[PDB]
Amino acid sequence: ERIRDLTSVQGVRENSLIGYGLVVGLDGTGDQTTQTPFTTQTLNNMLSQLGITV
Amino acid sequence: ERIRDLTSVQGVRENSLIGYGLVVGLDGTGDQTTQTPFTTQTLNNMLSQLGITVPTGTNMQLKNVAAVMVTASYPPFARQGQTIDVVVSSMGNAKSLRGGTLLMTPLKGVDSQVYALAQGNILVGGVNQLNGGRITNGAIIERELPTQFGAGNTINLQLNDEDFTMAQQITDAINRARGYGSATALDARTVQVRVPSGNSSQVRFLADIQNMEVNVTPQDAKVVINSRTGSVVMNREVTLDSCAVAQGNLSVTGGSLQSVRSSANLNSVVRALNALGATPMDLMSILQSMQSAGCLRAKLEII
Amino acid sequence: ERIRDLTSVQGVRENSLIGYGLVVGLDGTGDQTTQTPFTTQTLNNMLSQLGITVPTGTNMQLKNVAAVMVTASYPPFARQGQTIDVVVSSMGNAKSLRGGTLLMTPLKGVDSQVYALAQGNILVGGVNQLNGGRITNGAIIERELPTQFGAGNTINLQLNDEDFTMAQQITDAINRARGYGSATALDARTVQVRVPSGNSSQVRFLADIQNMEVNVTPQDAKVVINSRTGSVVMNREVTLDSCAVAQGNLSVTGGSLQSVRSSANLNSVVRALNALGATPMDLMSILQSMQSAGCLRAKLEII
Amino acid sequence: TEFIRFSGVVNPRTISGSNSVPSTQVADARIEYVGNGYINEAQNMGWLQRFFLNLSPM
Amino acid sequence: VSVTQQGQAAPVQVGQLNLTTFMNDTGLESIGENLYIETQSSGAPNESTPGL
């Protein structure tokens, strides 16, 4: 059980994924949204997608 | 009962549903509705749908209503009429959702189609989170997803963790239990299983396969370090090589350089590292330095 | 009496009804009606319907009236004249609904049709929620839903939790009790049962099936973590693998690295984790780190 | 009699909360505002004047 | 107690401030924090609207 600990197999590799999201349900410890316009912009985007146009 | 704990069946998967709703019945701990216009806008929308038209120019300052986002999981083979649990999370400047009620909320999928309808009473712990809650059986399934299960003679078991040895072990176990060419391995993560054509026969085959017992072969040595929570976890395959370690305010129980012996099993590694007298935050730096030097014969993963 | 606790009958489902109403008889704990124009607007609507026309330009400042939202459940096979319980939740800036009375409220469905009428006296606990209440038998059913029950020779039992083993067990139990081809499995969640044509015969068949006893096979190992309420729940299938754990302010009862033994049953797992001397909030991080490393042979679900 | 005719294609997400959309968000906007009666005929060139406007050297 | 509001030429009434009248004002017990309480020598606090 040492070769698996010393080498890696060609083609058997890991990639990296990134994305943007919103986290809700905080107890008043979220963004101020006055210094972060993108939070409100993306919340409005989500609401518009769901059918609400602010 | 190990195969069901090591793999997942192809096509038997869970989806994610999201939706918007209003939570009423709060004890003055709802939205301020002056900094959250969408709460009042959607309340007016609901009232208009119910037959009440509030004039556009009017000041509405509510205290018992909070705009919330509802999240749910669409289960495999979900059927209309079935109930699922939902999570309700406040969206803006609300104080608590302790005794609230979630009104009719359509839960959309990624394709923006309604798959469930959510309505129920929130349970909030009450150090405890106040702006988040859970409703058991809070949403009723309304749409069903087509699937290919029961069609064809091939089904893929997908391992939770990639391993050629574990894939071969599962394949050999299935071949030992249910005939010569019952299962084959495609890669380190997928095992292809031949099943009879039909629905009931495949359910029987999967029922026999799922509870099968497979002896887990030893995995790769791995040390998991969580600096955000301050934890270190070492599996049973971690070994150590002999080398000297020095760190601030740590000394022989004497000199600042302490010898670490060659260790073969996990008990020896734990004894050698406890001989250092290191705090876990110090142990993180020690382990990283030893991985850089080469004493630590394990994969150091920071999570 | 286990099949009725493990499955649901296709077509036998519950719907959700919503409506708007006014609650009167409060002891000065109602809406302010200056920040909630809809309360006064709907009170004027009710008075106009009853024959009283209050002039449009007039200041109405009420204290015993609260605008509320009423939620109810439409039961399976509901018939007009039957009574159901309703939940009454305040909507804006009301203080309490302790001794209120709900006036005539039409409960609409998703299709915006009246299915029930709600009117009664609210019961409020009175640490207790003041803006939410329940009325037992508060709504009378007014509309009935057509259904296909009694038509055809097939009925589907839908499992609460998807499992090929449990589906096969239910199918085998039905076949063992009521003939060879009485039940078949379609997927991990649905079991198709053949029943005689008619209404009474299918009711008899379902009555015999529902109270049948089925031995539940072991499920998947699962550790449920609720960070919002601070709870951890481990089922009987959770096992542990030997590995070392370190966390802040936790030490051998000595060194900061503590060994965790290989555990087969739940009692061994509980003993090993209690040997760590970890607070449940610390146990959450420990369990997540062990799942990342691989000691925890269970599915870690955060709810 | 006056006629105001409108045609076009509207994106659903451009519609406001009051079921309104400005005319500048409509893709193939066709807008027409015409009338009839002697008021409208008084705003038409005479046939001879149109002939001259199209065929006169200057 | 009348309160004026916007868009309402007529002031609204909010309530009556009633005064308590005793028959021996010397006899009340001084609690301390600018408060007097009825005693046996000044019993029967008579509520009345001011002016009568």
Phi and psi, residue B282, nearest 5°: -70, -35
Q: Which helix (H) or strand (E) holds E30?
A: strand E29-30
Three-state DSSP class for residue E27: helix
CA–CA distances in Å: residue B296 to residues B52, B221, B235, B248: 71, 10, 13, 20
Three-state DSSP class for residue A54: coil
Do C and B touch, 3+ Cβ pairs within 8 Å? The answer is: yes
DSSP letter assigned to residue D35: E
**Is the torsion defined by CA of B265, B270, B271, B275 positive or negative?**
positive
**Is the torsion defined by CA of E8, E11, E13, E17 positive or negative?**
positive
The 10 Å CB-count burial string (b at 16+, else e) for B218-243 is ebebbbbbbeebbbbbbbbbbbbeee
| Distance of alpha carbon B240 from alpha carbon B224, whole angstroms | 16
Three-state DSSP class for residue D51: helix
Nearest C-alpha in E relative to C34: E5
| Distance of alpha carbon B20 from alpha carbon B105, whole angstroms | 6
| Distance of alpha carbon E31 from alpha carbon E39, whole angstroms | 11
Contacts of E8 in chain C (CB under 8 A): 59
Interface test with A, best of D10, D11, D13 (most A CBs within 10 A): D13
Query: Which positions ≥6 away from D32 have C-beta within 8 Å?
Result: D3, D4, D5, D6
HSE (CB half, 13 Å, CA atoms) of B271? 8
Rounded to a whole number, what is the distance in Å from the CA of A5 to chain B's nearest CA?
6
CA–CA distances in Å: residue B85 to residues B120, B125, B140, C132: 10, 16, 9, 22
Q: How, if at all, do strands C222-226 and C299-302 pair?
A: parallel
Q: What is the 3-state secondary structure (H, E, C) of chain B?
A: CCHHHHEEECCCCCEEEEEEEEEECCCCCCCCCCCCHHHHHHHHHHHHHHCCCCCCCCCCCCCCEEEEEEEEEECCCCCCCCEEEEEEEECCCCCCCCCCEEEEEEEECCCCCEEEEEEEECECCCCCCCCEEEEEEEEEECCCCCCCCCCCCEEEEEECCCCHHHHHHHHHHHHHHHCCCCEEECCCCEEEEECCCCCHHHHHHHHHHHCCCCCCCCCCCEEEEECCCCEEEECCCCEECCEEECCCCCCCCCCCCEEECCECCHHHHHHHHHCCCCCHHHHHHHHHHHHHHCCEECEEEEC
Contacting partners of chain B (3+ CB pairs under 8 A): A, C, D
| Distance of alpha carbon E27 from alpha carbon E37, whole angstroms | 9
Query: Which positions ≥6 away from A38 have C-beta within 8 Å?
Result: none
Query: Taking CB atoms and an 8 Å limit, are D17 and A52 in contact across chains?
Result: yes
Give this entry's resolution in angstroms.
4.3
User: B179, B185, B194, B171: which is closest to B3 by C-alpha?
Assistant: B171
Out of A9, A25, A50, the one facing B90 most closely (by C-beta) is: A25
Compute, in degrees rounded to 10, the torsion defined by CA atoms B191, B194, B197, B200. Answer: -70
CA–CA distances in Å: residue C248 to residues B233, C1, C125, C254: 13, 49, 43, 13
Q: Tokens at residue D22, please?
A: 């400005």
Q: Which helix (H) or strand (E) holds A39?
A: helix A37-50
| Distance of alpha carbon B108 from alpha carbon B98, whole angstroms | 25
Could you tell me the maximum CA-CA distance found in chain D, to the nearest angstrom?
57
| Distance of alpha carbon B262 from alpha carbon A2, whole angstroms | 16
Interface test with C, best of B61, B64, B96 (most C CBs within 10 A): B64
| Distance of alpha carbon C253 from alpha carbon C278, whole angstroms | 12
DSSP letter assigned to residue D10: B
Three-state DSSP class for residue E38: coil
| Distance of alpha carbon C7 from alpha carbon C161, whole angstroms | 8
The 10 Å CB-count burial string (b at 16+, else e) for D3-35 is eeeeeeeeeeeeeeeeeebeeeebeeeeeeeee
Contacts of A43 in chain B (CB under 8 A): 91
**Chain A residues within 8 Å of chain D (Cβ atoms):** 48-49, 52-54
Q: Which amino acid is at C3?
A: I
Query: Taking CB atoms and an 8 Å limit, are B219 and C294 in contact across chains?
Result: yes
| Distance of alpha carbon B277 from alpha carbon B251, whole angstroms | 8
Query: Taking CB atoms and an 8 Å limit, are D18 and B56 in contact across chains?
Result: yes
Contacts of B162 in chain A (CB under 8 A): 12
Q: How, if at all, do strands B222-226 and B299-302 pair?
A: parallel
Phi and psi, residue B68, nearest 5°: -130, 155
Q: Which helix (H) or strand (E) holds D30?
A: strand D30-35
Rounded to a whole number, what is the distance in Å from the CA of C22 to chain E's nearest CA?
24
| Distance of alpha carbon D9 from alpha carbon D14, whole angstroms | 11
Q: Tokens at residue B61, please?
A: 């300052």
CA–CA distances in Å: residue B290 to residues B86, B252, C12: 46, 18, 63
| Distance of alpha carbon C214 from alpha carbon C235, whole angstroms | 20
| Distance of alpha carbon B101 from alpha carbon C71, whole angstroms | 9
| Distance of alpha carbon B249 from alpha carbon B238, whole angstroms | 26
Rounded to a whole number, what is the distance in Å from the CA of B181 to chain C's nearest CA?
22
Q: Tokens at residue B77, please?
A: 């083979």
**C-alpha angle B174/B177/B182, rounded to 5°?**
45
Q: Is D18 on the interface with B (CB under 8 A)?
A: yes
Q: Among all chains, which residue has been given the structure tokens 């008075």?
A: C47
C77 φ/ψ sector (left φ>0, alpha ψ -120 to 50, else beta): left
This structure was determined by cryo-EM
Rounded to a whole number, what is the distance in Å from the CA of B75 to chain C's nearest CA?
8
Q: Is C59 on the interface with E (CB under 8 A)?
A: yes
Residue B196 burial class via C-beta count within 10 angstroms: exposed 0-12, middle 13-18, buried 19 and up = exposed
Per the CB < 8 A criterion, the answer to whether C295 and C240 are in contact is yes
| Distance of alpha carbon C55 from alpha carbon C51, whole angstroms | 13
User: B117, B89, B85, B120: which is closest to C89 by C-alpha?
Assistant: B120
Q: What is the 3-state secondary structure (H, E, C) of chain C?
A: CCHHHHEEECCCCCEEEEEEEEEECCCCCCCCCCCCHHHHHHHHHHHHHHCCCCCCCCCCCCCCEEEEEEEEEECCCCCCCCEEEEEEEECCCCCCCCCCEEEEEEEECCCCCEEEEEEEECECCCCCCCCEEEEEEEEEECCCCCCCCCCCCEEEEEECCCCHHHHHHHHHHHHHHHCCCCEEECCCCEEEEECCCCCHHHHHHHHHHHCCCCCCCCCCCEEEEECCCCEEEECCCCEECCEEEEECCCCCCCCCCEEECCECCHHHHHHHHHCCCCCHHHHHHHHHHHHHHCCEECEEEEC
| Distance of alpha carbon A11 from alpha carbon C214, whole angstroms | 48
Q: How far apart are the first and last CA of chain A?
A: 60
| Distance of alpha carbon C26 from alpha carbon C47, whole angstroms | 19
Nearest C-alpha in E relative to C61: E12
B36 φ/ψ sector (left φ>0, alpha ψ -120 to 50, else beta): beta
Q: Which amino acid is at B213?
A: E
Q: Is D10 on the interface with A (CB under 8 A)?
A: no
Q: How, if at all, do strands C154-159 and C190-194 pair?
A: antiparallel
Per the CB < 8 A criterion, the answer to whether C266 and C233 are in contact is no
Nearest C-alpha in A relative to D17: A53
Contacts of B127 in chain C (CB under 8 A): 230
Rounded to a whole number, what is the distance in Å from the CA of C278 to chain B's nearest CA?
12
Q: Which helix (H) or strand (E) holds D38?
A: helix D38-41
Three-state DSSP class for residue D42: coil
Compute, in degrees rounded to 10, the torsion defined by CA atoms E4, E8, E10, E12. Answer: -50
Long-range contacts of E39-44 (CB under 8 A, 24+ apart): none
CA–CA distances in Å: residue D58 to residues B22, D52, D55: 72, 9, 8
Q: Is D17 on the interface with B (CB under 8 A)?
A: yes
Q: Tokens at residue D28, please?
A: 């193939």
Q: Tokens at residue C210, please?
A: 């529902």
User: C215, C159, C160, C161: which is closest to C183 by C-alpha?
Assistant: C159
Per the CB < 8 A criterion, the answer to whether B183 and B175 are in contact is yes
Q: Tokens at residue B227, please?
A: 């600096």
Nearest C-alpha in A relative to D15: A53
Q: Is E5 on the interface with C (CB under 8 A)?
A: yes
Q: Tokens at residue B165, please?
A: 């040895």
| Distance of alpha carbon C140 from alpha carbon C79, whole angstroms | 9
| Distance of alpha carbon D20 from alpha carbon D4, whole angstroms | 18
| Distance of alpha carbon C210 from alpha carbon C7, whole angstroms | 9
Q: Tokens at residue B182, please?
A: 């019952």
Do A and D touch, 3+ Cβ pairs within 8 Å? The answer is: yes
Query: Which positions ≥6 away from C50 have C-beta within 8 Å?
Result: none
| Distance of alpha carbon C40 from alpha carbon C25, whole angstroms | 15
Out of A25, A49, A52, the one facing B89 most closely (by C-beta) is: A25
Q: Which amino acid is at C145?
A: L
| Distance of alpha carbon B44 from alpha carbon B22, whole angstroms | 12
User: B12, B4, B9, B290: which is closest to B157 by C-alpha?
Assistant: B9
Per the CB < 8 A criterion, the answer to whether E3 and E14 are in contact is yes
Nearest C-alpha in E relative to C59: E8
Query: Which positions ≥6 away from A43 have C-beta within 8 Å?
Result: A22, B91
Contacts of B189 in chain A (CB under 8 A): none
Residues in chain A: 54
Residues in chain E: 52
Nearest C-alpha in B relative to C287: B233
**Chain B residues within 8 Å of chain D (Cβ atoms):** 41, 45, 56
Query: Which positions ≥6 away from E6 have C-beta within 8 Å?
Result: none
Nearest C-alpha in B relative to A43: B91
| Distance of alpha carbon C243 from alpha carbon B266, whole angstroms | 7
Query: Taking CB atoms and an 8 Å limit, are E5 and C61 in contact across chains?
Result: no
Per the CB < 8 A criterion, the answer to whether B303 and B226 are in contact is yes
| Distance of alpha carbon C239 from alpha carbon C203, whole angstroms | 44
Query: Taking CB atoms and an 8 Å limit, are D13 and A49 in contact across chains?
Result: yes
User: B165, B197, B196, B170: which is closest to B183 by C-alpha?
Assistant: B170
Three-state DSSP class for residue D3: strand
Residue A54 burial class via C-beta count within 10 angstroms: exposed 0-12, middle 13-18, buried 19 and up = middle
Angle between helices C164-178 and B200-210 (to 10 degrees): 120
Nearest C-alpha in A relative to D18: A53
Query: Which positions ≥6 away from B29 have C-beta within 8 Å?
Result: B63, B66, B94, B95, B96, B97, B98, B130
Q: What is the CA radius of gyration of chain B?
A: 28
Q: Among all chains, which residue has been given the structure tokens 């955060």?
A: C302
Q: Tokens at residue C219, please?
A: 């499920």
**C-alpha angle C60/E9/E1, rounded to 5°?**
70
Q: Tokens at residue A37, please?
A: 């316009």
Q: Is C128 on the interface with E (CB under 8 A)?
A: no
Contacts of A52 in chain B (CB under 8 A): 20, 38, 41-42, 45
Nearest C-alpha in D relative to A48: D13
CA–CA distances in Å: residue C123 to residues B28, B271, C30, C139, E15: 19, 63, 16, 14, 31
Do E and D touch, 3+ Cβ pairs within 8 Å? The answer is: no
**Is the torsion defined by CA of A18, A21, A23, A28 positive or negative?**
positive
User: C148, C39, C126, C156: which is closest to C91 by C-alpha?
Assistant: C39
